Amino acid sequence: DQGAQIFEAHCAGCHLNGGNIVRRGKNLKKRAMAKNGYTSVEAIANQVTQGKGNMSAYGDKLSSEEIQAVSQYVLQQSQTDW
Ligand code: HEC
Ligand SMILES: [Cl-]
Ligand SMILES: [Cl-]
Ligand SMILES: [Cl-]
Ligand SMILES: [Cl-]
Ligand code: NA
Ligand code: NA
Numbered sequence: 001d002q003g004a005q006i007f008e009a010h011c012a013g014c015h016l017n018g019g020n021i022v023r024r025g026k027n028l029k030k031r032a033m034a035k036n037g038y039t040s041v042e043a044i045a046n047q048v049t050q051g052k053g054n055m056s057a058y059g060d061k062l063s064s065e066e067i068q069a070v071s072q073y074v075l076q077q078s079q080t081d082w
């Protein structure tokens with residue numbers, strides 16, 4: 001539940017319903033996530049913490065516990081397709 005709330009507050013601006021309005025080829029749905037190896041909590045949490053390209057780093061914005069919770073939410077949603 002907390003993971004979904006964090007996602008709504010911090011991630012849905014760019015990734016609503018698992019999309020990516022900024023970088024077409026890097027969404028949160030099964031195909032792109034599997035291709036890029038975002039298939040574990042740790043893989044996702046590392047990317048969220050440090051940022052990448054035009055995506056900001058969240059390591060100074062969200063706590064480690066919040067990053068874990070949102071990463072689990074994204075993993076579950078991706079694996080089951082949003
Ligand atoms: C727009 C300002 C964004 C917000 C808010 C968040 N993300 Fe993002 N994300 C964004 C871009 C431009 C990209 C591509 C970065 C690149 O590699 O060039 C991404 C990518 C991801 C990914 C990887 C998806 C994939 O490879 O298919 C993940 C797992 C991801 N973003 C997660 C995520 C979370 C959990 C966010 C809130 C804390 C979040 N993003 C915010 C743009 C934006
Ligand atoms: Cl981009
Ligand atoms: Cl990537
Ligand atoms: Cl990373
Ligand atoms: Cl940043
Ligand atoms: Na909410
Ligand atoms: Na674009």
Ligand code: NA
Pocket residue numbers: 060061
């Ligand atoms: Na801070």
